[PDB]
Design a protein around this ligand. Structure first.
Ligand code: MG
Ligand code: MG
Ligand code: MG
Ligand code: MG
Ligand code: MG
Ligand code: MG
Ligand code: MG
Ligand code: MG
Ligand code: MG
Ligand code: MG
Ligand code: MG
Ligand code: MG
Ligand code: MG
Ligand code: MG
Ligand code: MG
Ligand code: MG
Ligand code: MG
Ligand code: MG
Ligand code: MG
Ligand code: MG
Ligand code: MG
Ligand code: MG
Ligand code: MG
Ligand code: MG
Ligand code: MG
Ligand code: MG
Ligand code: MG
Ligand code: MG
Ligand code: MG
Ligand code: MG
Ligand code: MG
Ligand code: MG
Ligand code: MG
Ligand code: MG
Ligand code: MG
Ligand code: MG
Ligand code: MG
Ligand code: MG
Ligand code: MG
Ligand code: MG
Ligand code: MG
Ligand code: MG
Ligand code: MG
Ligand code: MG
Ligand code: MG
Ligand code: MG
Ligand code: MG
Ligand code: MG
Ligand code: MG
Ligand code: MG
Ligand code: MG
Ligand code: MG
Ligand code: MG
Ligand code: MG
Ligand code: MG
Lengths: 197, 49, 127, 172, 106
RNA sequence: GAAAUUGUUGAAAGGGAAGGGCAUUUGAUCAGACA
RNA sequence: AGAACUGGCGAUGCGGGAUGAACCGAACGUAGAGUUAAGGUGCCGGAAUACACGCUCAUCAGACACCACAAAAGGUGUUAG
RNA sequence: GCCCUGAAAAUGGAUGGCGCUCAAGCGUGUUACCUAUACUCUACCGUCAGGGUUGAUAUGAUGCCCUGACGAGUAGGCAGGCGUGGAGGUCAGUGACGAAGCCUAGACCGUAAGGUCGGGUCGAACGGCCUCUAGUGCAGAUCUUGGUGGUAGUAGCAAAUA
RNA sequence: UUUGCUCCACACAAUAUAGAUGGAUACGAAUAAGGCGUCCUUGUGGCGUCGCUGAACCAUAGCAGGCUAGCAACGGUGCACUUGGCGGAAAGGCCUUGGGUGCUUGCUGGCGAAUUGCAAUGUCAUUUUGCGUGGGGAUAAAUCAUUUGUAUACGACUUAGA
């Protein structure tokens, strides 16, 4: 559809967001994902916290370096969910993964670009209302992630500036609609209506 | 089988690897928590033993 | 110039090399059939080399034809060459490898006059 | 077992010299096709009389159609079933628009609640509960209260493309 | 104009395959904007170009093209099967491709 | 004056072996047939 | 460990059961087009993040025959009787 | 019924992995869809079988032509063939104007054993066909004899005063 | 060591390419609730309206887009300049001023297009590098050997030397 698709992680379910991100790559679609700290997992926080420590104990006995690596960051928790859905040990697999970028927050370029969403992984459309679920950022911070507060600080800063942008814009688009209206009832305008516009 | 007799291990795994350091000048891996009320000054100093 | 014929269909151009002929020098590529008891090849496990078998045999109609349509025929002298006088559209003369240089030009020359195709004119050609 | 039709089946003990014109028994049978229906018939019949298909004859098979297929109706349903550890009679109530719909969801319910597959179930009786207040199960009664209305809160529209440019909304 | 495009964009997905065995003689193609087998019936028979580049000029160009045709639809979500004159290289899994509008039937 | 095995030159490839099968890209290389 | 009848493996690849002598499907000349089996169709991975009614929330949930285990006994968790 | 307790083992780890909770879970139903060396249709190969055809004046009667069905395979049987050394016949065969041999990700024929050619190297002999003959075909035998590697510029070359 | 380096400009030459072919089109937050307009007492406020998909919005006509004329507008837009300002999460981009300049399909005109032969991607992207030309700019170091012992099996480390 588009050269790059930026996805607001926020309010999406890891393995569903993953499952679509994976396919998208394999089919040639570059993707970036943002706000992975605001990503969701079904199951109450404790369940996934316990789950994560399961992951923690696995390590190469003779040398904990050769062994499974545990990344604590929300983007990186995501990427794990994703990499596992990609034949990442093949050229074609290494290729697809490189069309992928994951990020906590929304760092430059991507904050002036538009982000989309993936309804078939949106939590609010998928989870039965009532079921307990989990936020990546809180999960990660529990297993070592060092940077929740900083991301939050920078985001609130970012969210302010973007509120200016919008306001500024909603102003301009009000004028536009006004103009667009004093041209209504004209011939050109009625003709277009006829043709569905 | 099982040790036979128990004894603590030999030495501390918190100091691995036990390799030569990357420099003669050990690094300050942390500084004192900042209290911005006090006047300005350093928080360390160089010297020779 | 050859008799017309149906499209020549080769069925399996790839040479059938011996198993492990690529693995140890002492094993020539010349086909040789595995007889051993456990062998993957002889048991035709998905993944290994195929073996020659009668399915691959070429169309009775185009067999022995070589690209140009002519069956080749080894030729040592003129007399030999001349056996293809009433068969120019069907056989091609190939000059034997031990024919001398000066004999090759006598053969080539006659072949021309008879309109007989030669498959290796250029052999020993004092160019 | 699928999507049922209801059949009247009629059979009767192959005639004999000393008993020409034996007696004729009918069963209503919910099955998905007439072949299964004739099987079921013989199944219960050898459970009641001394016959089996070998020595008997199906006389007539006819699909019965719902009398008022767009009339909402309160069905009282009676069932015999086998569990893992014993066998059990049971009464359920189903509200729908035809005996054929009703038996579809009973088999659904029996399977979903008691893990009863089709083989292990016996319809005793399906009949239209005429006067309300001889309706007994609440989960039905609930739908008879006057001027009933309810919202359908938290609306989930199915997305047709993978990406969306909005953030949805479940207003409804 | 800014647009000149007379084809429809498309993607080389996989070969035809089992779980563990693929068949290079059939490629599977995702056609932009086609979602159903019915939808994809329109494109059956349309011809398909995979267009690539190279270092050696040849018949005076540095652009070569593999040609093929859509042959049948594939599964439930608008994917389509295709054959090509020579099977496509498999590095192309995930590369673009053009489906033309000819042979026309409108 | 073969082979194992070696030096040089030229070309290629190489993220914990290598070699193989079906298929095609790319490079190199080549037969035939046109009239 | 030892018999009975058949079907197999041994002597046999192919598809499925991740894996595997014996299970399931199906037995093999070289190939094109079609259709299927058993088994599958979120992604790995070809194939509906299909439809439909229930049930289930596990601070060690569960997830498909052979098969890679669990029992007596209990629960005022919840479901239907 | 599902769930919970009852439920303890040794390297870190397995519903196949990711991950999934109005499921991507459990019970059940309805469609569609994917894909085996299997099924249907078609070409080609081979095997077996049934026909047809001695009529000259041209080329295979073990032939030529039509038709149908079939094709797994250890041990094992049989068959039709490939290749070597020597022997009878023959082609008045090849050859110092270069035999044989050897080399060659060059060509061509055969399903295959193998066969043919080109180029290079070489230097005295050699082959096709019908027969005859056997000291006749190698990857193995802790096979025989010879030759050669990795190991490796490695172990080491340090007793007896200098 | 034979005039080398760098930044801008063009030029030739190579080499590539995980895959341009109108546009990645920017609040936040909630989902048992929101967006937008409007009013007012500025609030968890009144009133109005929208959703039910981006099937949208924007752009889009001209030799892949030629050469030309005019009118109505004073708008749009490309480009190099200049004014003020904002952006450090990876800012390396955004906004604003002012003249200049090209285009305008807002409307109306003159000319052109064939023979690429009934299709053949019919070649319009961007990667990295190499070689000369001349427009700005800049004129080091590391290593060996020597040496110290805060170091050391050898390398390595740490000093020192116009
Ligand atoms: Mg102990
Ligand atoms: Mg170091
Ligand atoms: Mg052998
Ligand atoms: Mg063995
Ligand atoms: Mg065996
Ligand atoms: Mg009735
Ligand atoms: Mg010599
Ligand atoms: Mg090479
Ligand atoms: Mg190949
Ligand atoms: Mg059996
Ligand atoms: Mg045995
Ligand atoms: Mg078998
Ligand atoms: Mg298999
Ligand atoms: Mg298993
Ligand atoms: Mg995987
Ligand atoms: Mg798929
Ligand atoms: Mg469907
Ligand atoms: Mg069982
Ligand atoms: Mg119990
Ligand atoms: Mg209970
Ligand atoms: Mg298991
Ligand atoms: Mg799975
Ligand atoms: Mg189910
Ligand atoms: Mg076949
Ligand atoms: Mg057949
Ligand atoms: Mg056989
Ligand atoms: Mg047999
Ligand atoms: Mg012989
Ligand atoms: Mg002999
Ligand atoms: Mg001898
Ligand atoms: Mg060689
Ligand atoms: Mg030749
Ligand atoms: Mg020569
Ligand atoms: Mg010679
Ligand atoms: Mg001599
Ligand atoms: Mg003989
Ligand atoms: Mg012998
Ligand atoms: Mg052997
Ligand atoms: Mg040997
Ligand atoms: Mg042997
Ligand atoms: Mg030996
Ligand atoms: Mg030796
Ligand atoms: Mg030495
Ligand atoms: Mg030494
Ligand atoms: Mg010693
Ligand atoms: Mg001494
Ligand atoms: Mg590439
Ligand atoms: Mg409102
Ligand atoms: Mg407002
Ligand atoms: Mg209000
Ligand atoms: Mg819009
Ligand atoms: Mg113009
Ligand atoms: Mg970035
Ligand atoms: Mg004009
Ligand atoms: Mg210069």
């Amino acid at each position: 559809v588009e050269p790059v698709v930026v996805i607001d992680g926020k309010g999406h379910l890891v393995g569903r967001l993953a499952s679509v991100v994976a396919k998208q790559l394999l089919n040639g679609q570059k993707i970036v994902v943002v706000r992975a700290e605001e990503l969701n997992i079904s199951g109450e926080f404790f369940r996934n916290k316990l789950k994560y420590h399961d992951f923690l104990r696995k390590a190469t006995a003779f040398n904990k370096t050769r062994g499974p690596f545990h990344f604590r960051a929300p983007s990186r928790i995501f990427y794990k969910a994703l990499r596992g859905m990609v034949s990442h040990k093949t050229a074609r697999g290494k290729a697809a993964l490189e069309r992928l970028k994951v990020f906590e927050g929304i760092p430059p370029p991507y904050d002036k670009k538009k982000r989309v969403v993936v309804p078939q992984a949106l939590r609010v459309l998928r989870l039965k209302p009532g079921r307990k679920y989990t936020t990546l950022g809180k999960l990660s911070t529990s297993v070592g992630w060092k940077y929740e507060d900083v991301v939050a600080k920078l985001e609130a800063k970012r969210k302010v500036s973007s509120a200016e942008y919008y306001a500024k814009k909603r102003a301009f688009t009000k004028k536009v609609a006004s103009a667009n209206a004093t041209a209504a009832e004209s011939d050109v305008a009625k003709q277009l209506a006829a043709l569905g516009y | 089988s099982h040790r036979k007799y128990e004894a603590p291990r030999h030495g501390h795994l918190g100091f691995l690897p036990r390799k030569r350091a990357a420099s003669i000048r050990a690094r300050v891996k942390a500084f004192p928590k900042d209290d911005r009320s006090k006047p300005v000054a350093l928080t360390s100093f160089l010297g020779y033993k | 110039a050859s008799l017309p014929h149906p499209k020549i269909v080769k069925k399996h151009t790839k040479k059938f090399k011996r198993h492990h002929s690529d693995r140890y020098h002492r094993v020539a590529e010349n086909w040789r059939k595995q007889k051993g008891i456990d062998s993957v090849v002889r048991r035709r496990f998905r993944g290994n080399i195929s073996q020659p078998k009668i399915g691959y045999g070429s169309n009775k109609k185009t067999k022995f034809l070589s690209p140009s349509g002519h069956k080749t025929f080894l030729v040592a002298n003129v007399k030999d060459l001349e056996t293809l006088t009433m068969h120019t559209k069907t056989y091609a003369a190939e000059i034997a490898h031990n024919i001398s240089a000066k004999n090759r030009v006598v053969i080539l020359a006659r072949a021309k006059a008879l309109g007989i195709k030669v498959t290796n004119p250029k052999g020993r050609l004092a160019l | 077992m699928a999507h049922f039709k209801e059949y009247q089946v009629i059979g009767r003990r192959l005639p004999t010299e000393s008993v020409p014109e034996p007696k004729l028994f009918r069963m209503r049978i919910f099955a998905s096709n007439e072949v299964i229906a004739k099987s079921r018939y013989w199944y219960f019949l050898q459970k009641l009389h001394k016959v089996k298909k070998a020595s008997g004859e199906i006389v007539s098979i006819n699909q019965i159609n719902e009398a008022h297929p767009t009339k909402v109706k309160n069905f009282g349903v009676w069932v015999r079933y086998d569990s893992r550890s014993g066998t059990h009679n049971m009464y359920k109530e189903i509200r729908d628009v035809s005996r054929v719909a009703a038996v579809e969801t009973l088999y659904q319910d029996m399977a979903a609640r008691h893990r009863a597959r089709f083989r292990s179930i016996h319809i005793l009786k399906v009949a239209e509960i005429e006067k309300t207040a001889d309706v007994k199960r609440q989960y039905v009664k609930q739908f008879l209260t006057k001027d009933l209305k309810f919202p359908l809160p938290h609306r989930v529209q199915k997305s047709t493309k993978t990406f969306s440019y909005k953030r949805p909304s479940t207003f409804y | 104009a800014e647009s000149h495009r007379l084809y429809v964009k498309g993607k080389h997905l996989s070969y035809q395959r089992s779980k563990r065995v693929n068949n290079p003689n059939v490629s599977l193609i995702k056609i932009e904007g086609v979602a159903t087998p019915q939808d994809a019936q329109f494109y059956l028979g349309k011809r398909i170009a995979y267009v690539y580049r190279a270092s050696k000029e040849v018949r005076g160009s540095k652009i070569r093209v593999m040609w093929g045709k859509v042959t049948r639809t594939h599964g439930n979500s608008g994917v389509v099967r295709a054959t090509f004159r020579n099977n496509l290289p498999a590095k192309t899994f995930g590369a673009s491709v053009r489906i033309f509008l000819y042979p026309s039937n409108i």
